[PDB]
């Protein structure tokens, strides 16, 4: 229950591909209340992305089976019930991350870069809630996602270079939000195209440290643009 110890255990867990363990270690580190180092922030993000990603993948599989068993009442009801069980896990994971963000990560962020990083992650995890939201709750969840993305977007444009991997990755995910959650393909394409074009225009702002991340995300942006205009 010492911080440097918790971080070392999270690195062990990562090596062991035990992402539940690794998320629990970094939840405990975050709850100690001090601002996370960049290393600690990336461990937290990697851990929860793997934890929530497993449920999102399972949810898509079962949701697809549910749709393919239309007209097969017993099978479809079993798929529905299993999907709902997975949804409960997914919501609980998202609610944990979103609570860490509200209580510690966003209030403690002393730099523009990490403000953008954590508002992006707030947008992402509300987007994951939106992926499985139905009914009365969905509108407010979508609104929370959009508001977090929008604030991150404004800070990133004011404070970071157009080639910054966090600014580019924010554009990528905000664009996906518009396409998939808001069913707004033209806005999605405009956002992704602008982010790609503004980075192309200032490639001298790349750094040796992060140019591989930047150019990867630029390719993903154009890959989405290609998919959505095909």
């Amino acid at each position: 229950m010492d911080k440097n110890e918790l971080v070392q255990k999270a690195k062990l867990a990562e090596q062991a591909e035990r992402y539940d363990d690794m998320a629990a270690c970094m939840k405990s580190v975050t709850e100690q209340g001090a601002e996370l180092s960049n290393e600690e922030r990336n461990l937290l993000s990697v851990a929860y992305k793997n934890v929530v990603g497993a449920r999102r993948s399972s949810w898509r599989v079962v949701s697809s089976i549910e749709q393919k068993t239309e007209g097969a009442e017993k099978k479809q009801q079993m798929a529905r019930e299993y999907r709902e069980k997975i949804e409960t896990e997914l919501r609980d994971i998202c609610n944990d991350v979103l609570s860490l963000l509200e209580k510690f990560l966003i209030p403690n962020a002393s730099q523009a870069e990490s403000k953008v990083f954590y508002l992006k992650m707030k947008g992402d995890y509300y987007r994951y809630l939106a992926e499985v939201a139905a009914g009365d709750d969905k509108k407010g969840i979508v609104d929370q996602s959009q508001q977090a993305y929008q604030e991150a977007f404004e800070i990133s444009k004011k404070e970071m270079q157009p080639t910054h991997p966090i600014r580019l990755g924010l554009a990528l995910n905000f664009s996906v939000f518009y396409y998939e959650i808001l069913n707004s393909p033209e806005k999605a394409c405009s956002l992704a195209k602008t982010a790609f074009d503004e980075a192309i225009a200032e490639l001298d702002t790349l750094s040796e440290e992060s140019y591989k991340d930047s150019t990867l995300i630029m390719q993903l942006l154009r890959d989405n643009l290609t998919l959505w205009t095909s």
């Binding site: 993000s45 992305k49 990755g169 996906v176 993903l220 890959d223 989405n224 998919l227």
Partner: peptide, 7 residues
Amino acid sequence: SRNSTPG
């Protein structure tokens, strides 16, 4: 399928 950020 479309991509979001790996991280």
